[PDB]
Design a protein around this ligand. Structure first.
Ligand SMILES: */C=C\C(=O)Nc1cc(Nc2nccc(-c3cn(C)c4ccccc34)n2)c(OC)cc1N(C)CCN(C)C
Length: 319
């Protein structure tokens, strides 16, 4: 009773793009800021380029192709856009460059300029992302502020689909316990509802401006804490209304937790009266710079002339 997935998968020529710089280096993988130019399209598209670092090179190519499979299949303004893959000896995943980086980092660097209206909107855009995933029957299994990226301060998108699964499909090292639901931790169960719990943690990270959840606590302890019924603390800036939503995402009974489409509604409502629900000093006059429009802003980011720059979101196949 599932539809045929007719998404296209595009193969990019290694000649078509250039790596400007290294966004991140990790034992697991390395990512590059770069620029992609389809031959004869007269466009330049800012891109991020990913190569994995598994113990064996074939096993690395397995994990990254699954991720491409997922991204090629989703199309939604709050989910990260795949452009294609490159068949170099180690496979390269090519996606839309998100110039402001991940949310967790962004919220740390700019906490003194981040207002209630921004935070409630990220929370809306995020539930929209996940609810879209729910429609697609996709469980992310690693929702977290490090895996939300910022196209602009007005616009975020979910990312890191490496662990993603279809609901109930058959699938353990360095799992992220802190964001995990209890049923997930005790019985390796995972659901949209399990995702909802992670959304809760994710929201808390934003309301705490990047605080580490269960800071100073060993992962082994966490399952026991949650079993006692302890949870994460109420962030200072958080009215009870908001905190209550977090706490529902952290109920033991998963059917009890809210649904992403319900989260959209609720945070969407508060975004109409933001200072009623988040209390932040100086909230009234905080500005986050968004020089999306300037070509010059682009030129600085990738260090080139940019008259023919195009963001992935305005670049649509058919080619
Ligand atoms: C949370 C770290 C981070 O994302 N930093 C970051 C990210 C970007 N833009 C971007 N755009 C698309 C994809 C990625 C991306 C995906 N994955 C798995 C990554 C791993 C490591 C790094 C980036 C990844 N990133 C960016 O664009 C300018 C800058 C940036 N920063 C701020 C680099 C410094 N951070 C590590 C703090």
């Amino acid at each position: 009773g599932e539809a045929p997935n007719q998404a296209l998968l595009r193969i990019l020529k290694e000649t078509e793009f250039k790596k400007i710089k290294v966004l991140g280096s990790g034992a697991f993988g390395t990512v590059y800021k770069g620029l992609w130019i389809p031959e004869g399209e007269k466009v330049k598209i800012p891109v991020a380029i990913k190569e994995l670092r598994e113990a064996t090179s074939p096993k690395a190519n397995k994990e990254i192709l699954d991720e491409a499979y997922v991204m090629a299949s989703v199309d939604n303004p709050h989910v990260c856009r795949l452009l294609g893959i490159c068949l170099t000896s180690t496979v390269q995943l090519i996606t839309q460059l998100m110039p402001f980086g991940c949310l967790l980092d962004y919220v740390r660097e700019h906490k003194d300029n981040i207002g209630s209206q921004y935070l409630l909107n990220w929370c809306v855009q995020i539930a929209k992302g996940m609810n879209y995933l729910e429609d697609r029957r996709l469980v992310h299994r690693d929702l977290a502020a490090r895996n939300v990226l910022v196209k602009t301060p007005q616009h975020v998108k979910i990312t890191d689909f490496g662990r993603a699964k279809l609901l109930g499909a058959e699938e353990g090292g360095k799992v992220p316990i802190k964001w995990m639901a209890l049923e997930s931790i005790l019985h390796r169960i995972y659901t949209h509802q399990s995702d909802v719990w992670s959304y809760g943690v994710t929201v808390w990270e934003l309301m705490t401006f990047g605080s580490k959840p269960y800071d100073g606590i060993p992962a082994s302890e966490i399952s026991s804490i949650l079993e006692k019924g302890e949870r994460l603390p109420q962030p200072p800036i958080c009215t009870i209304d908001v905190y209550m939503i977090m706490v529902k995402c952290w109920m033991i009974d998963a059917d009890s937790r809210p649904k992403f489409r319900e989260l959209i509604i609720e945070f969407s409502k508060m975004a109409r009266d933001p200072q009623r629900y988040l209390v932040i000093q100086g909230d009234e006059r905080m500005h986050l710079p968004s020089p999306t429009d300037s070509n010059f802003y682009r030129a600085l980011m990738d260090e080139e002339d940019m008259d023919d720059v195009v963001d992935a979101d305005e670049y649509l196949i058919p080619q």
